[PDB]
Amino acid sequence: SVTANIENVKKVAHHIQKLTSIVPEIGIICGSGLGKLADGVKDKITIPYTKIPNFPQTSSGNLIFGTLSGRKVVVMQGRFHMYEGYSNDTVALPIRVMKLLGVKILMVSNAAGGLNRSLKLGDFVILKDHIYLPGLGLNNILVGPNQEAFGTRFPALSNAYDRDLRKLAVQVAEENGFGNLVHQGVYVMNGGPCYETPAECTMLLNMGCDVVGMSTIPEVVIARHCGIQVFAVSLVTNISVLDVEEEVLATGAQRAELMQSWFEKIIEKLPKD
Amino acid sequence: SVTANIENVKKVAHHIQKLTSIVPEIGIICGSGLGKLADGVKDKITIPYTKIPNFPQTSVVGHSGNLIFGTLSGRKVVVMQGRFHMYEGYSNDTVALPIRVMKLLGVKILMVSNAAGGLNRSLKLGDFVILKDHIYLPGLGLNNILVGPNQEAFGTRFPALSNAYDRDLRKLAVQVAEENGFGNLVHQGVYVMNGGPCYETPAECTMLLNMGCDVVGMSTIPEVVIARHCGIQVFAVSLVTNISVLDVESDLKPNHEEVLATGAQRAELMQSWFEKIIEKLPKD
Amino acid sequence: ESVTANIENVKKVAHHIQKLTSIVPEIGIICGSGLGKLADGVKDKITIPYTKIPNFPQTSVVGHSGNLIFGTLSGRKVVVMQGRFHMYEGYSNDTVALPIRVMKLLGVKILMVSNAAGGLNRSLKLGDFVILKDHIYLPGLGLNNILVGPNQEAFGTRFPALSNAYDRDLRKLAVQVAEENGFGNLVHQGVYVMNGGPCYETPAECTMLLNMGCDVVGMSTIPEVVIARHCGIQVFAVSLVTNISVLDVESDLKPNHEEVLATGAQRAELMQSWFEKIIEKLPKD
Numbered sequence: 001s002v003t004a005n006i007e008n009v010k011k012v013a014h015h016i017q018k019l020t021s022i023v024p025e026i027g028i029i030c031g032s033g034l035g036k037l038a039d040g041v042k043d044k045i046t047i048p049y050t051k052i053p054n055f056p057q058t059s060s061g062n063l064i065f066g067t068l069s070g071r072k073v074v075v076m077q078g079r080f081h082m083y084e085g086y087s088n089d090t091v092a093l094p095i096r097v098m099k100l101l102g103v104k105i106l107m108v109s110n111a112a113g114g115l116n117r118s119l120k121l122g123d124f125v126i127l128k129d130h131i132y133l134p135g136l137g138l139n140n141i142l143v144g145p146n147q148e149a150f151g152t153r154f155p156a157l158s159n160a161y162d163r164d165l166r167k168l169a170v171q172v173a174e175e176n177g178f179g180n181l182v183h184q185g186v187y188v189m190n191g192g193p194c195y196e197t198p199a200e201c202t203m204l205l206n207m208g209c210d211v212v213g214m215s216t217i218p219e220v221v222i223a224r225h226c227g228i229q230v231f232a233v234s235l236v237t238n239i240s241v242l243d244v245e246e247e248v249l250a251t252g253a254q255r256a257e258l259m260q261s262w263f264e265k266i267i268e269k270l271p272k273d
Numbered sequence: 274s275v276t277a278n279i280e281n282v283k284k285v286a287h288h289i290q291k292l293t294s295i296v297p298e299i300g301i302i303c304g305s306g307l308g309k310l311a312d313g314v315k316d317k318i319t320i321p322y323t324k325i326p327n328f329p330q331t332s333v334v335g336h337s338g339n340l341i342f343g344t345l346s347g348r349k350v351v352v353m354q355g356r357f358h359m360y361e362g363y364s365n366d367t368v369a370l371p372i373r374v375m376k377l378l379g380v381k382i383l384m385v386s387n388a389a390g391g392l393n394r395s396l397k398l399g400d401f402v403i404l405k406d407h408i409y410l411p412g413l414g415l416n417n418i419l420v421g422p423n424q425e426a427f428g429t430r431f432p433a434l435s436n437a438y439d440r441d442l443r444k445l446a447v448q449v450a451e452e453n454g455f456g457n458l459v460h461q462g463v464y465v466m467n468g469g470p471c472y473e474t475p476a477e478c479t480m481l482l483n484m485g486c487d488v489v490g491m492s493t494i495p496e497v498v499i500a501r502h503c504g505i506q507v508f509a510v511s512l513v514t515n516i517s518v519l520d521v522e523s524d525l526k527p528n529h530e531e532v533l534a535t536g537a538q539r540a541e542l543m544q545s546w547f548e549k550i551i552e553k554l555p556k557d
Numbered sequence: 558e559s560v561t562a563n564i565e566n567v568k569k570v571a572h573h574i575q576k577l578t579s580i581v582p583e584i585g586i587i588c589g590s591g592l593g594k595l596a597d598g599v600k601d602k603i604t605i606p607y608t609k610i611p612n613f614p615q616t617s618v619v620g621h622s623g624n625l626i627f628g629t630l631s632g633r634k635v636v637v638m639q640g641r642f643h644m645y646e647g648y649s650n651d652t653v654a655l656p657i658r659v660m661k662l663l664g665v666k667i668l669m670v671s672n673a674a675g676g677l678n679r680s681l682k683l684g685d686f687v688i689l690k691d692h693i694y695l696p697g698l699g700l701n702n703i704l705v706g707p708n709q710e711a712f713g714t715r716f717p718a719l720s721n722a723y724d725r726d727l728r729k730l731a732v733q734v735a736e737e738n739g740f741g742n743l744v745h746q747g748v749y750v751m752n753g754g755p756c757y758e759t760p761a762e763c764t765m766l767l768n769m770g771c772d773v774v775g776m777s778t779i780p781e782v783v784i785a786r787h788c789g790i791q792v793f794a795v796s797l798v799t800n801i802s803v804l805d806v807e808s809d810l811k812p813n814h815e816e817v818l819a820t821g822a823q824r825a826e827l828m829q830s831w832f833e834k835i836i837e838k839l840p841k842d
């Protein structure tokens with residue numbers, strides 16, 4: 001792992017800038033099986049991680065540059081999860097690279113378990129807040145010397161999930177007839193990689209959590225630290241079992257396609273400087 | 274220290290298999306109250322940890338733990354006399370390795386005891402709490418024993434913990450206690466792990482109780498996670514060695530000495546119980 | 558890195574300090590929020606930069622090395638830590654623990670600490686004082702307890718109890734002193750929960766912690782307290798409410814570190830007077 005300090009992050013950024021002339025305004029991270037939720041990318045340039053010195057490596061991932069709905073984007077195909085053993089610096093670096101490349105808004109998707117009992121398989125839950133269990137317990141991604149070039153020692157997490165972006169996302173869903181699928185709620189991070197027990201799920205639900213997953217929050221924290229606005233959404237891929245105690249099942253990719261359309265239509269309506 | 278991967282785990286298993294002809298069907302981790310069970314193994318072969326190359330080392334004030342092979346109630350067992358607590362600073366791999374070795378040796382069922390504080394107000398000192406579920410506080414906060422590359426040889430990347438405390442074993446254990454006249458001491462409950470090694474404050478105990486926890490301890494969940502990961506069935510019991518203090522204006526404070534005493538006074542009954550459970554475990 | 562807080566290393570540090578001063582501290586003080594002035598109040602003193610103590614941990618206050626200050630306060634001998642060690646900075650357990658263990662070897666019997674905290678309890682007002690009567694050590698419950706590792710038997714037992722961690726007699730005295738000196742209305746007692754940090758708590762996190770029965774939240778203190786209790790040092794700790802936690806995600810109010818600092822500095826003279834007046838009333842031989 002290389003330290004995600006300004007000098008290391010600049011070297012990686014400068015290197016990418018030799019490989020593409022596209023200056024992204026929007027960063028997109030697609031979650032576990034949510035790829036292509038960003039690949040109507042027009043006039044694209046594809047940069048494999050292996051091509052970028054000091055950029056983290058997947059256990060084949062790509063950085064994809066291009067235009068979506070008239071706007072310049074960079075899409076991370078392949079994310080870094082704390083349960084895999086990646087360091088704080090490894091996970092922070094891509095987001096800080098995004099900042100140096102010009103990203104102003106980060107759009108994140110993930111798959112999550114539905115804790116809230118009103119949730120259905122296939123629902124979208126826009127994150128309006130989070131509970132960073134690892135961070136409260138001394139594994140916050142910002143532990144260590146503060147990189148001052150990027151942000152302040154004690155970032156506030158007020159309006160972490162930009163309310164104006166959430167409003168827009170909801171309006172876009174409604175306008176395109178899938179508003180009934182969209183909720184807003186609190187995402188809690190389980191460091192993982194075990195799925196949550198019923199007692200764990202009950203505790204988390206009672207803590208005020210709506211969905212649970214193993215990712216996203218660390219990226220959000222780094223984004224907010226360096227002043228990137230954040231939009232994040234969970235796809236509810238399963239309903240959490242709350243108490244201890246064999247059919248033909250379809251597992252299609254329609255929701256993935258829907259989410260892709262959703263992100264494209266949001267980007268279409270984002271403000272542009 | 275030594276990675277709990279297939280190569281290293283097989284090397285250890287093979288060393289052990291050179292030292293005994295006993296192929297264990299049941300593994301037992303001796304925690305609080307199981308001291309006499311360990312010493313009552315029939316036709317036992319004792320293998321000190323120090324004698325097993327690459328097997329993690331742990332001592333009780335200097336004396337190495339042992340693997341003990343033999344029979345209990347006519348079934349082949351391996352008993353771990355000497356466990357590995359995370360509060361001692363042992364690595365994820367060090368704690369996982371013995372369990373994965375048990376898997377390769379042939380273990381199908383893991384039985385474990387521990388000492389716990391009683392949060393649930395109905396519990397009495399010396400009660401037995403069969404774990405029916407757990408809350409793995411270190412695991413939720415990025416100190417899960419499986420963090421790191423998954424060892425595919427042993428199990429899947431994201432293990433489900435749905436029926437982690439096998440419902441059939443729990444049923445049997447209750448039945449045996451009931452049949453033998455001590456059903457009144459047996460409960461089932463949710464165990465929450467405190468990394469430790471501090472005892473819980475009253476504010477911590479109040480929070481844990483209100484989270485839905487019945488007992489709190491500093492061990493066991495990591496082993497259970499590794500066991501479930503590699504498909505070993507689990508039976509675990511907490512011995513209530515302290516009644517959790519929930520009021521800060523109290524002068525009663527937990528001490529490991531009385532914890533040891535409770536373990537000592539209940540060891541005979543717990544041994545009887547485990548022996549009688551093992552006798553009735555399915556498939557013999 | 559780095560230096561183990563075991564008896565050998567702690568003895569070396571203490572013996573070095575003892576070559577610099579003959580003052581035998583009975584009270585140790587960790588300057589947190591509101592105690593910025595305390596160093597200046599200590600009389601007949603010697604100031605020892607951390608940089609001048611071999612194998613002592615290093616940290617900066619303002620733009621200079623932290624200091625260990627020895628002298629007299631309210632007629633009692635004290636050692637003051639000017640510059641503290643926060644886990645969110647990346648310091649090790651041994652680093653945080655060593656100074657407390659050094660205090661023990663120097664003769665310290667009582668540790669007084671202040672810190673800045675967010676007010677979760679809804680009856681709290683900005684600038685209030687919340688004496689800690691108990692805590693919830695989230696990092697500790699989640700396997701980041703400062704004592705994780707081999708137990709150092711010279712200092713304490715493997716499984717410390719945290720009963721009466723916040724000495725009830727010191728808490729009683731502190732309340733009495735505030736009452737007598739006309740600021741009893743600023744003083745509460747409560748449960749402190751540690752957020753590892755360095756992020757301020759989200760509204761959802763604040764709501765969770767409040768419902769867990771926490772009154773204030775901060776990023777320090779508990780690890781030092783655990784080390785003090787382990788080695789038998791009596792503890793008095795107070796949170797200055799430097800921000801009122803935002804529980805509502807649709808609120809425009811937010812914690813601001815400049816304001817946190819201002820709130821702490823504003824209360825500093827009163828906090829210091831309070832500590833000085835508690836020390837004056839402590840029993841002594």
Ligand SMILES: Nc1ncnc2[nH]cnc12
Nearest residue numbers: 111112113195212213214
């Ligand atoms: N229920 C769940 N818990 C944690 N991570 C998840 N990812 C998808 N579903 C999940």
